[PDB]
A and B are shown apart, each in its own frame.
Chain A
Amino acid sequence: LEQILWRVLRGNLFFKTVEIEQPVYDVKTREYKHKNAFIVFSHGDLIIKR
């Protein structure tokens, strides 16, 4: 996801990855996997929508 973000949004966009202590079950995957936070900040409404 980070590589895709830095490619499509070639400009500068900060990231705030934070690790989750325990896995959370997924609906389609039917399994609990370790997750991380996807906090991201950028300017421009169109950029936010993208």
Chain B
Amino acid sequence: SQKNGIATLLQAEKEAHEIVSKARKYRQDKLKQAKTDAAKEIDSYKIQKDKELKEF
């Protein structure tokens, strides 16, 4: 059972490493989301300028 359990544990460690890689990919997606949030923050000033342009 030691060798078979070791092989199963190696497969499980591979799965955990894949999960860590997926978490890194999700972190990249969150970075893209932060970029989109910064875009929304810029668009707030864009709307402010459009109001000011319409203010004139």
Contacts and interface: CB of A to CB of B under 8 A. Distances in A.
B47 interface: no
A16 B10 contact: no
Given A14-B6, A16-B7, 11 more contacts: A14-B3, A14-B7, A14-B10, A15-B3, A16-B3, A16-B4, A39-B7, A41-B7, A41-B10, A41-B11, A43-B14
Mostly, the B contact residues are helix
A14 B12 CA distance: 14
Interface of A: 14-16, 39, 41, 43
Q: Which 6 A-B pairs have the closest CB atoms?
A: A14-B6, A41-B10, A14-B7, A41-B7, A16-B7, A14-B10
Nearest to B2: A14
A12 to B, nearest CB: 9
Contacts of A41: 7, 10-11
A16 B3 CA distance: 7
